[model samples]
Target: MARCERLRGAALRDVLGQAQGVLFDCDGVLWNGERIVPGAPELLQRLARAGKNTLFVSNNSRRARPELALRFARLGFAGLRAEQLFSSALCAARLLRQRLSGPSGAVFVLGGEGLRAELRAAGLRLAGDPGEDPRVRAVLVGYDEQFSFSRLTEACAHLRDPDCLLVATDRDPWHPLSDGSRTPGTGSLAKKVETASGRQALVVGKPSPYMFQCITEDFSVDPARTLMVGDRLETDILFGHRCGMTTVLTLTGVSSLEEAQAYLTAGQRDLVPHYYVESIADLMEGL
Candidate 1:
């Protein structure tokens, strides 16, 4: 089998031209936590000059777009707007709103302020003080840094109702630390609730096409002419494939070139990316 092309120079420019819009995965491609990935800022600027539409997507539901923009500015990334950002939290809200018949309903939150804010913006009401209440229509779970036994118990109880919908931001097992380390993400906590409640969550983050669906409709984007740049093959690459966008895997994050090639070798062609670069900076060439 042919190896993955290491994109650069003319080849990189060719793909760039083909991409009408570019979807970026946050944790690995743009920054490692708060630390901005080298050349990421410059690459974004060039994309703007070239009139390429750029959007950022993340599985992290803990932070909203405003908070994300603040973090970006703190890390020296300027000119970012809330609209350009799409978190799993936002996607969850959109998905939940679509599923609901009424304009608003009570949601038992197992997440942070970002998830809370998004749900509110989408016109969904929050369940006040997680107590025994059949009025709670759904259990929305995302990354909660303050996850505790009490929270899990409350979630499990609410989930016991067959009529209650269970929604998850993303099923990512771990969160990437700025120091190249990792810690458990929402999936770990969500799994505990899943096991105890004996029900699965409708995951709305990367690899689940729902978030991309919202993006395309919101922007009227044509997936065939779009490009997705990310670090993880499981989430980012798979998401792009499902959306019918060209996928570019960068080595600055989680998945390695070896792992990506291995998937192709195993005939898992859909999991592999169409192009790759050692870093996001490499894509800046010929711009």
Candidate 2:
């Protein structure tokens, strides 16, 4: 069977007739890896005209807030600001400070520039690799192409010690690229270490309470009146489902119509958005 049609134009207004805010994910929803999707600018205008409160909540923690803002502006997205986007790195850093630190909390991160900066801002010490010494307090893993085997072995070893916590920025196996391709994200690497150590890492990205907290607090939007739209199922759709908001899955990213079609369980489908559009093109009329 073909995928269901999404609500658009007057129909979209009718579907979200009572909702107050629209929560959009960056990667697949607005821009597919590369350039901005067609109808995006118009969609924003429509939403703004409709008097909707818009916030972009993304899981890509590789870039800090200011950098993320600049990127959106370059893509022609209006009104994007460091304050408007929720950086998972920021949430991760705050979580670490709240849960792991006192006088003796330390972190070992193998990730991007954003992660390093957030850790420093949080005042958490970057610790030694595990093979050398398991005295580390927490192993915070995120996205990094330069991750070394030595680092993995060390981090996994630290997880073996109960005093250490293994926290992953997200559980996505693939990263969405600007060119519209897939690459292994930190979640893929986290799987390796989790499997090796046989310990579950607490994820601090999408679908997590902390993420919902950050966005809701930042925009002051209620959970009941919000919606989450993105390209992936595991994170975006599920995140909305868990938070009592609607979800939309686009075909522009990692998961395709075929993938979603293959796994159309009632419960899974229930987590899906009230509608799924082909691309942002649908957003022009859809909502």
Candidate 3:
């Protein structure tokens, strides 16, 4: 059962001591756009020095691993390896690579260059690559700013094959902007594609548990000994509960303390994190 307790003092120290690793949600939990959360980098460094595995899990599919690594470095997060970062784009590529039947199959991606780069890096061919129109094995929906009716129609054409896999990076309807606004996220695009094609998409991001499978494939992590830290209740907190991790909500980004308490009051345990902090900076005390 999730208590949604405020983690502090001795309880915080106990939780930190017990954790073998910590899985983090990138956007709201760590940084907001270009601004890194105060003391976030140090917290990660402390976790590393404490011999706890720190891995990032993000639902954003726009940036590939390399670019994401650069973003972390530019934002003052140090000593982080590329492999420690996992995005929906990377996992989606992995999933497609594992599921695609033959070498002749290609993925039709409705995303940015970063996503295409990830798929290509995974040895999976894209439908629009300079070559013959091979059989479209999958259609991946991500954050596409240029998404239009034509792309939707083309995606539906591929889905007409009935064997074509429809995949979505994340179901986040929108993302918060730096200037107190909102931008449409991949989930909105995926929903449009699903509506147009009449095909269900296999979501490969947080709250789906597929991302956890991808993580476990590369590293051995005991969920019971791990902490899932994020700022979103519906996606991050829910994902933590599903993966059997201790959930900690950081209030520096999207979800609010009131929202978490409301869920707890409503008996929605999955959406309620086990504990929370005013900000992840507060976590440094536990170290």
Leading candidate by TM-score: 3
* lDDT for position 238 in model 2: 73
Can you list the residue pairs that collide in candidate 2? 8-285, 8-286, 9-285, 33-178, 34-178, 247-273
- CA RMSD, predictions in order: 2.2, 3.5, 1.2
Greater-lDDT candidate between 2 and 3: 3
Please provide, for model 1 over 1-287, each residue's C-alpha lDDT reduced to its tens digit, 9 standing for 90 to 100: 22368888788778888778889998988888666789999988888889889898988876777787898788777887878888899889988887875544588998888889888888777885444443778998888878889988988887787989999888898887667778898788778888889988898999899889878767868888888899998889989888888898999888999999899989887789998999998888848
In model 1, what lDDT does residue 250 have? 94
Off by over 4 Å in 2: 1-5, 101-103, 128-135, 258-262, 265-267
TM-score of 1: 0.93
Worst 10 residues of 2 by lDDT: 126-135
Question: Considering lDDT, which of the candidate structures 1 and 3 is the better prediction for this target?
Answer: 3
Candidate 2 similarity to native, TM-score: 0.86
lDDT value, residue 72 of candidate 3: 90
Query: How far does residue 277 in candidate 1 sit from its true spot (Å)?
Result: 0.3
> Candidate 1, clashing residue pairs?
none
Task: Estimate, for each residue in 100-158, the C-alpha lDDT of model 2 and write its tens digit.
Answer: 75556578886888787777777766774233432578888888778889888877877
TM-score of each: 0.93, 0.86, 0.97
**What are the lDDT scores of the predictions, listed in order?**
0.84, 0.74, 0.91
Model 2 accuracy (lDDT, Cα): 0.74
